[PDB]
Amino acid sequence: NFGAILS
Amino acid sequence: NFGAILS
Amino acid sequence: NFGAILS
Amino acid sequence: NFGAILS
Amino acid sequence: NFGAILS
Amino acid sequence: NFGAILS
Amino acid sequence: NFGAILS
Amino acid sequence: NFGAILS
Amino acid sequence: NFGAILS
Amino acid sequence: NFGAILS
Amino acid sequence: NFGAILS
Amino acid sequence: NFGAILS
């Protein structure tokens, strides 16, 4: 899978 | 701010 | 899924 | 202000 | 879902 | 003032 | 003033 | 879920 | 102010 | 999952 | 602020 | 898996 977080 | 995605 | 919060 | 979304 | 508050 | 929405 | 939201 | 408080 | 999200 | 808090 | 993701 | 924290 994949994932991300942005500030 | 904050944004996230997770598959 | 995905999600976000804005100030 | 504040805004949010969550799937 | 989603939601918000405004001052 | 104040305004709100919640789904 | 004060405003709040909680899902 | 999500939530916020404003002064 | 304060805002939060938790999936 | 994911999560965030904003001041 | 603080943001996190964990798969 | 994967994970992250942002300040």
DSSP letter string, J1-7 = -EEEEE-
Q: In units of Å, what resolution does this entry have?
A: 1.2
- Judged by CB atoms closer than 8 Å, whether chains meet at D4 and C6 is answered as yes
Query: Residue H3 forms beta bridges with which residues?
Result: G6, I4
Token output for H5: 């408080």
Of I1, I3, I7, the CB nearest to D6: I7
d(CA I4, CA I7): 10
CA nearest neighbour of G5 among K2, C2, I3, C4: I3
> CB count, 10 Å around CB of D3?
19
Beta strand pairing call for G3-6 and C2-6: unpaired
Local structure of residue E5 (DSSP, 8 states):
E
For H3, name the nearest residue in chain G, comparing CA atoms only. Answer: G6
DSSP strand pairing (H2-6 vs E2-6): unpaired
Sign of CA dihedral C1, K3, E7, H2: positive
**Nearest CA-CA partner of E2 in D4, C6, L5:** D4
**Residues J7, K1 contacting (CB under 8 angstroms):** yes
